[PDB]
């Protein structure tokens, strides 16, 4: 029998995607030689299987390249040789994904998986298809897009402490729509830590911190006044700051406007993209636990703000209840858990 050669690419093929390696397989014989070069003549790294039957590229192929593959198979029946040439995808534009939380992090039970692209994604389904999420213990989750660039993945209920989460964004060589291809792959892994749920009840004006179901701190607080109230709902804890200059102009509100502001505060924990924080407020200690006086932040004492800074972590949960405000928008950026599960589960890839 004359040896046969089978490649994972077709001679004369265009638009070949570089999201997979290129392989060469020999039948009725073994591979005596296999080389692959690009248009400039530079060789492509590869490896031959010990049995001599399979050859595969070992480095990723580039966009907008013409590769020439030459292979020779030898067998008792005879010899066979083939030359193939193919052209890879020619992207119109490239987009880089950014994944949160960070690799190796320990996050709270409310932390979703976040994949943010630096460009608008026309084929959301293709993006979701290219993201493999592993969970241990395994749990059902789903994708949901906060905007044209960022997609979130979370389960129906808060994570179970101790869950391992692994995120592989394999967007390289993937057509994300309108000629937009992924600039690279990204791969992160994180773990869920203690259950920490702080509840701010406007009827009592107390921020109570519960760690694994036990109350460990009770903080008098002053929330947003009626004209600028704090929205009810579930907030995901974000970044921590020993101190931060609060500037309303970052939210489209001129500083010189009635609701504008610009001041420096200590021990600030972010809980919404819309600008809600837990922070030190020495000027309202007298009102904390009695009346609301802020632009929407949870004003707490300096010692309680610092305690919150030291003992709360990204992904922990703050829930506000019984305020005169509405509900935090589900697409705020840290309000994911305000979207009903059935809506989140059905997604919005269009």
Ligand X SMILES: *C(=O)/C=C\C(=O)Nc1ccc(Cl)cc1
Binding residues: 175, 178-179, 261, 274-275, 299
- For Na ion, the closer CB: 32 or 37: 37
Among Na ion, ligand X, none, partner that 263 touches (CB below 5 to 8 angstroms by kind): ligand X
Give catalytic status of residue 279 as yes or no: yes
Q: Which stretch binds Na ion (CB under 5 A): 21-29, 207-215, 246-254, 300-308?
A: 246-254
- For Na ion, the closer CB: 38 or 120: 38
Question: Considering the complex, what minimum distance in angstroms separates the CB of residue 280 from ligand X?
Answer: 10
By rule CB under 6 A, what string of x and - marks binding of each residue 195-234 to ligand X?
----------------------------------------
Query: Is residue 105 within the footprint of Na ion (CB under 5 A)?
Result: no
Q: Which stretch binds ligand X (CB under 6 A): 153-161, 273-281, 309-317, 336-344?
A: 273-281
Q: How many CB atoms lie within 10 A of CB 248?
A: 18
Question: Considering the complex, what minimum distance in angstroms separates the CB of residue 247 from Na ion?
Answer: 5
Q: Which stretch binds ligand X (CB under 6 A): 13-21, 137-145, 155-163, 261-269?
A: 261-269
Interacting residue with ligand X among 18, 24, 246, 339 (CB under 6 A): 246
Query: Is residue 267 within the footprint of ligand X (CB under 6 A)?
Result: no
Among ligand X, Na ion, none, partner that 261 touches (CB below 5 to 8 angstroms by kind): ligand X
Interacting residue with ligand X among 29, 108, 296, 315 (CB under 6 A): 296
157, 189, 279, 290: the active-site residue: 279
Residue list for the binding site for Ca(2+): 175, 178-179
SS (H, E, C) the chain: CCCEEEECCCCCCCCECCCCCCEEEEECCEEEEEEEECCCCCECCEEECCCCCEEEECCCCCCCCEEEEEEEEECCCCEEEEEEEEEECCCCEEECEEEECCCCCEECCCCCEEEEECCCCCCHHHHHHCEEEEEECCCCEEEEECCCCEEEEEECCCCCCCCEEEEEECCECCECCCCEEECCCEEEEEEECCCEEEEEECCCCEEEEEECCEEEEEEECECECCCCCCCEEEEECCCEEEEEEEEHHHHCCCCCCCCCCEEEEEEEEECCCCCCEEEECHHHCCCCCCCCCECCCEEECHHHHHHHHHHCCCCCEEEEECCCCCECCCCCCCCHHHCCHHHHHHCCCC
Query: Is residue 278 within the footprint of ligand X (CB under 6 A)?
Result: no
Q: Which residues are catalytic?
A: 279, 297
The contact set with Na ion (CB under 5 A) reads: 38, 247, 250
The contact set with ligand X (CB under 6 A) reads: 246, 261, 263, 265, 275-277, 294-297
């Amino acid at each position: 029998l004359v040896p046969k050669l089978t490649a994972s690419v077709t001679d004369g093929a265009v638009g070949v995607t570089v999201d997979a390696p290129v392989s060469v397989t020999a039948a009725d014989g073994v591979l005596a030689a296999v080389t692959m070069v690009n248009d400039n003549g530079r060789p492509v790294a590869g490896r031959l299987s010990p049995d001599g039957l399979r050859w595969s590229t070992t480095e990723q192929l580039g966009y907008n390249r013409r590769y020439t593959l030459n292979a020779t198979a030898l067998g008792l029946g005879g010899a066979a040789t083939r030359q193939l040439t193919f052209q890879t995808s020619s992207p119109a534009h490239l987009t880089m994904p950014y994944v949160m939380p960070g690799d190796g992090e320990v996050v709270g039970v409310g932390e979703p998986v976040a994949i943010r692209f630096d460009e608008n994604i026309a084929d959301r389904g293709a993006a979701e298809k290219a993201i493999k999420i592993t969970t241990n213990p395994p749990v059902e989750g789903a994708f949901y897009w906060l905007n044209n660039r960022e997609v979130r993945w979370r389960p129906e209920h808060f994570w179970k402490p101790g869950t391992a989460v692994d995120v592989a964004v394999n967007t390289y060589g993937v057509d994300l729509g309108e000629g937009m291809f992924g600039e690279d792959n990204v791969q992160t892994h994180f773990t869920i830590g203690d259950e920490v749920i702080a509840t701010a009840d406007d009827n009592t004006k107390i921020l109570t911190v519960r760690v694994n179901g036990e109350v460990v701190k009770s903080m008098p607080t002053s929330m947003g006044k009626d004209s600028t109230p704090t929205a009810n709902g579930i907030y995901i804890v974000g970044s921590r700051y020993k101190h931060i200059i609060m500037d309303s102009s970052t939210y489209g509100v001129p500083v010189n406007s009635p609701n504008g502001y610009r001041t420096d505060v200590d021990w600030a924990t972010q809980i919404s993209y819309s600008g809600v924080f837990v922070h030190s407020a020495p000027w309202s200690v007298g009102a904390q636990g009695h009346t609301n006086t802020s632009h929407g932040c949870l004003n707490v004492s300096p010692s309680n703000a610092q305690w919150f800074y030291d003992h709360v972590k990204r992904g922990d949960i703050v829930e506000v209840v019984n305020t005169v405000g509405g509900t935090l928008p589900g697409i705020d950026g840290l309000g994911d858990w305000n979207i009903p599960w059935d809506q989140w589960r059905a997604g919005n890839a269009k």
